[PDB]
Amino acid sequence: LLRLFESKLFDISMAISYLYNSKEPGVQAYIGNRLFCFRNEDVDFYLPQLLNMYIHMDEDVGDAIKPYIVHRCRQSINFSLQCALLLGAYSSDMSFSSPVRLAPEREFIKSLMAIGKRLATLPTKEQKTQRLISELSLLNHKLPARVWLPTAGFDHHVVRVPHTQAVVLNSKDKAPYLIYVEVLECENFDTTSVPARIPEWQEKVRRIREGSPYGHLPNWRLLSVIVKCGDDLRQELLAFQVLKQLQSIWEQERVPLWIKPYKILVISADSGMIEPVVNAVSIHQVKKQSQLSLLDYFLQEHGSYTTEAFLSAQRNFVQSCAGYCLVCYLLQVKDRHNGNILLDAEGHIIHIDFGFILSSSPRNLGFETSAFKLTTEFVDVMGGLDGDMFNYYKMLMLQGLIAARKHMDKVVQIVEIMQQGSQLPCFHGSSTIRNLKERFHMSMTEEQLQLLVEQMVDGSMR
């Protein structure tokens, strides 16, 4: 990057950029020393990009990043966990500060994933659930301990697992399972000590709490996760990064677009944990259960046409649908079906299963392509092709596309970096980044962008 950054900014994304892109002899180390000057929480986002740069890139870059992580690994234990896991997952084809530091955690995770790997023999989901709880009952024996769910945005200890409420999501061999976990918040996980056991919609929080020994605690907080033992979440993690970025961007420029990136934890190349969305539901399931048109569902659940509940509902619907049309466009998300889109109790829609994105396309699939489509049933919810909020939809898409163009470097950066030494389908040659850049359309005028958006909408409906 041409040295010549002397014309100062200076920004964390851009610093990463100078670290990745720069061929100058002195700058890699410089940035390496400038990372310390940054808000730790800001740096922790690009973490998977640092290690993948650490792993697959030059010794200059390696030795450049190297001191920062050690500074932090000493500083934060969860950070260390992350560094380890990601060091294991992202290299293919290429009582703390003691060695027992992470052992309880390692064994916790190992347990959960083993449990998940044991379900294969049992064909049908119900059997799997029963066996699951039967095996899952055993952890509270060893609990509490020094253990935490990195998913949580707070330091904590896992003191209990309400085993009875565990469920299994599907009948496959690699089929995931959802669990609920009772934890108690600390101020600092490193300083604070381990509490002591007590052996005796989402209101599940309640009915668990009142049914829990540690329930009475003011610290007490419930968490939930999805343990996928046979699945590779690295791609999906990339999706998480991108989504989070676009969220930040759209927040900055004050565009109403609503998307909810859900957290991702990559434990291994075949393993990982996801943080579930609450109160949202499959939208296929709505069609099945309700036996109602999506609109009619909106009219059943929230109010009627003039009811503020309805208006808010479909407004959030529109904004959401828009944000995700844009996301799906840029990121070239595929494999969209009702199974992949949820609907929250507030009336948003939430996409999942990001496994197929960018250059990654599903097999089979003769002559039908699996992509975001605006169903008639959707428009019916919004309005109609001529409808008061449809123009709002399109306008929103336009605005978001603009702001995206503005911040494009930040978004492309993540991907471009994570392309290094990857075995993943999403990366195909230099095609991926190219097509992405061209997907931002920096050469277009907002009128041509309005046109484009007209083409995108028209192209969705068919």
Ligand SMILES: COc1ccc(-c2c(C)nc3c(N)cc(Cl)nn23)cc1OC
């Ligand atoms: C198969 O793998 C997955 C299974 C479930 C979810 C997920 C999340 C993060 N939130 C929800 C939710 N609220 C409902 C359902 Cl059914 N799934 N789900 C995401 C997955 O990643 C692809």
